Write an enzyme that holds these catalytic residues in place. Structure first.
Site, PDB file in Angstrom:
ATOM      1  N   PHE A  33       0.830  -1.197   0.000  1.00 24.54           N
ATOM      2  CA  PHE A  33       0.000   0.000   0.000  1.00 24.54           C
ATOM      3  C   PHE A  33       0.868   1.251   0.000  1.00 24.54           C
ATOM      4  O   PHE A  33       0.453   2.300  -0.491  1.00 24.54           O
ATOM      5  CB  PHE A  33      -0.973   0.003   1.193  1.00 24.54           C
ATOM      6  CG  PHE A  33      -2.291   0.688   0.906  1.00 24.54           C
ATOM      7  CD1 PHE A  33      -3.268   0.059   0.137  1.00 24.54           C
ATOM      8  CD2 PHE A  33      -2.553   1.960   1.400  1.00 24.54           C
ATOM      9  CE1 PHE A  33      -4.475   0.691  -0.138  1.00 24.54           C
ATOM     10  CE2 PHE A  33      -3.761   2.599   1.131  1.00 24.54           C
ATOM     11  CZ  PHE A  33      -4.724   1.962   0.366  1.00 24.54           C
ATOM     12  N   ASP A  42      -7.002  -1.070   6.275  1.00 22.33           N
ATOM     13  CA  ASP A  42      -7.587  -1.356   4.977  1.00 22.33           C
ATOM     14  C   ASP A  42      -8.064  -2.795   4.924  1.00 22.33           C
ATOM     15  O   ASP A  42      -7.262  -3.705   4.749  1.00 22.33           O
ATOM     16  CB  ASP A  42      -6.550  -1.140   3.875  1.00 22.33           C
ATOM     17  CG  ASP A  42      -7.119  -1.376   2.480  1.00 22.33           C
ATOM     18  OD1 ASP A  42      -8.271  -1.871   2.371  1.00 22.33           O
ATOM     19  OD2 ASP A  42      -6.415  -1.061   1.495  1.00 22.33           O
ATOM     20  N   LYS A  49     -15.494  -4.688  -1.892  1.00 21.59           N
ATOM     21  CA  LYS A  49     -15.589  -6.018  -2.509  1.00 21.59           C
ATOM     22  C   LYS A  49     -16.799  -6.834  -2.075  1.00 21.59           C
ATOM     23  O   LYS A  49     -17.855  -6.742  -2.688  1.00 21.59           O
ATOM     24  CB  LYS A  49     -14.310  -6.837  -2.280  1.00 21.59           C
ATOM     25  CG  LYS A  49     -13.031  -6.164  -2.762  1.00 21.59           C
ATOM     26  CD  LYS A  49     -13.126  -5.761  -4.223  1.00 21.59           C
ATOM     27  CE  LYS A  49     -11.769  -5.317  -4.783  1.00 21.59           C
ATOM     28  NZ  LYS A  49     -11.875  -4.838  -6.211  1.00 21.59           N
TER      29      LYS A  49
END
Lengths: 385, 385
Positions: free
Chosen positions: A140, A204, A233
């Site tokens: 990330f 996250d 998602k």
């Protein structure tokens, strides 16, 4: 027509910006997908956790049709009835004061950056235009993003020293880096360094959450509670693009009613789909199933592949798994093509790692069959190097 | 549960990042929406052209359910059958070699920037890291953008001189600036200056296209054909977030197969919805209806408001309309609240302009009623200064 007619057709009329495995799907259901020639495959990507609940879940479809008959979109210029039902549901479920609904994982990241920096200026009183966010290295140069290695508490605290840091945004397990699991000590210490230096601890969970690793939040494995959670998602069971940020009043209220570009974010249809998708995940005990089947599957896989020359390491947690290969000995694209030939579809990240992430409604008998498939496919490359 | 209850609920559990008009919708159908207390309103925002086909169009819902039963998502790691059907359909319809499907208007803008610059480097051989994009001023500082006034061919060519310019991205009518219509000469000249200086002429038709101004592409009014088209909003009749970039092989093939982030972009469900949403627009002659009813409605409105003190200007094209007010005499938020009270909902951009954009299935009798409503509303404010 054939799978090949479809692929040539996409090659003529569509941009060539993606590089898919040569399989053409027309149907999915639970843990299985089916191609043009009616061959069936185990889906071991799950569209990157969008179909944790399995493909084409009828309950989610039902919530979708019901809301879609009533109202699919009014903008954020007005209120809908469905949005607030969703917001109440999610905040209660996860235990945060507030939630902000959006469409994509990328939107959730970008909005999180803004949220973090604005809390930096308003609450932590950081000097203007200089709020810094810490992220991890492989997963990330980009301004005001300080990069530290994953799973390194030392390098982290070293960066937390900077008074201009407003947040640390981190994944409970690194996905894009090839499924990197942290040492058990890491997150308990992340929570501390963060609480200590007065820094937003942002988790996250767009990939790791919602049952993928056994829990609603992977961070629940480490017994920490982040200040800010990112979700996506599986929020929709793959029926709609949905993402969310959860945070308490002290951080969330830092955002003011402003004039933003028009959006699908927070539309009534997404709101209804989202509640039902999480209800399905929970009512069917999908987190529990992944928590049960996960470690056994991983260990049994680690065992059956212990003598393989091409395998470097089996990694994972719950049903978030991967096999890293020695990319000097094998081509990983070819491995994926062989999986496909063998009845299981997935994709490689970078040059080394193959993703193993089936929908969470998978049964132990199915995971046993998939184990056979994985072993047989690796065997092929071992027998032939 | 009253509207008030819904609004308080959103205030407690949702972020406060938006500032909606205090109306709570639970149903929409064609040109109408309905609130908690069953009051009915004309929708004069159309969720920013997402519902050009009208709210909850049954054909679109049908295409949605049909595809949703089969497959809603596999990632771009694999092929689906639905995507290529959509791509073939759109390219043929609009007359471009290729299309690239995404989720949001913002994604389409950002991808367009990358496409333009990469064509800049590969084809126009612009020096590295220095490809410049020309945008317009009020509507569309930051690295590698050049800003010129809208509808100013002089200022434009002045900027086209720079050899490092790869593209000019522009709206056929400026939306966010308050519905600014160009002089008839402008676009014919944009096409020339662009073709002359070897610059991509990129038309942002996310709001203006798909019937809103009478045509499938607003640029078709000016008899020009842009090198690149951006589409969104109505692509889905509001049932799903969808956007697209259309371009010919010489530009599109600049993007190469890569390791891109997980996307809903080009998913099978969006692909099916998109084809049906355009079919509905075309089969029902919605572009034609807007082209017929539009100018009359605008002129008749310009006439009935000619003596109003608070009205500065009536602007528009087709059914993309707006009224700009003298913000020194009235508060435009209050005007919107009054519209609402009178049975028509819309929103103001900036401090001055109210958007007038109904779904395109609206009838002349309906527009006459809405005219009464707009006049009576403006009358209220006039009678009070």
């Amino acid at each position: 027509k054939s799978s090949q007619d479809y692929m040539n057709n996409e090659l003529t009329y569509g941009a060539h910006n993606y590089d898919p495995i040569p399989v053409v799907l027309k149907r999915g259901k639970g843990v299985f997908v089916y191609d043009i020639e009616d061959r069936r495959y185990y889906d071991f990507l799950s569209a990157y956790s969008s179909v944790n609940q399995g493909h084409c879940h009828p309950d989610i479809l039902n919530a979708m049709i019901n809301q879609a008959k009533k109202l699919t979109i009014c903008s954020r210029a007005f209120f809908s009835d469905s949005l607030g039902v969703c917001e109440r549901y999610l905040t209660n479920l996860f235990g945060y004061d507030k939630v902000l609904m959006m469409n994509t994982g990328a939107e959730a990241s970008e909005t999180a950056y803004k949220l973090c920096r604005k809390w930096g200026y308003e609450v932590k009183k950081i000097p203007e235009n200089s709020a810094k966010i810490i992220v991890c290295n492989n997963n990330f140069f980009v301004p005001n993003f300080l990069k530290v290695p994953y799973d390194d508490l030392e390098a982290l605290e070293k960066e937390l020293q900077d008074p201009n840091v407003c947040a640390f945004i981190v994944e409970p397990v690194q996905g894009e880096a090839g499924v990197i699991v942290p040492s058990d000590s890491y997150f308990p210490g992340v929570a501390s360094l963060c609480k200590k230096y007065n820094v937003l601890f942002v988790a996250d969970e767009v990939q790791t959450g919602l049952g993928r690793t056994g829990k609603l939040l992977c961070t629940h494995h480490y017994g920490v509670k982040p200040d800010v959670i990112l979700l996506g998602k599986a929020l929709s069971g793959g029926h709609y693009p949905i993402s969310a940020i959860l945070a308490n009043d002290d951080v969330m209220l830092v955002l003011k009613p402003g004039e933003h570009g028009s959006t699908y974010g927070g539309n009534p249809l997404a709101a209804a789909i989202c509640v039902e998708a999480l209800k399905v995940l929970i009512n069917e005990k999908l987190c529990e199933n992944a928590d049960k089947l996960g470690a056994p599957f991983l260990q049994n896989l680690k065992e059956q592949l212990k003598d393989s020359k091409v395998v470097r390491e089996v990694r994972g947690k719950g049903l978030l798994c991967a096999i890293e290969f020695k990319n000097d000995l094998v081509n990983v694209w070819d491995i994926c093509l062989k999986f496909k030939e063998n009845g299981l579809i997935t994709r490689s990240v970078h040059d080394k790692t193959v993703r193993l992430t089936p929908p969470l409604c998978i049964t132990k008998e199915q995971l046993d069959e998939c184990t056979e498939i994985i072993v047989k496919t690796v065997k092929f490359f071992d027998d032939n190097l």
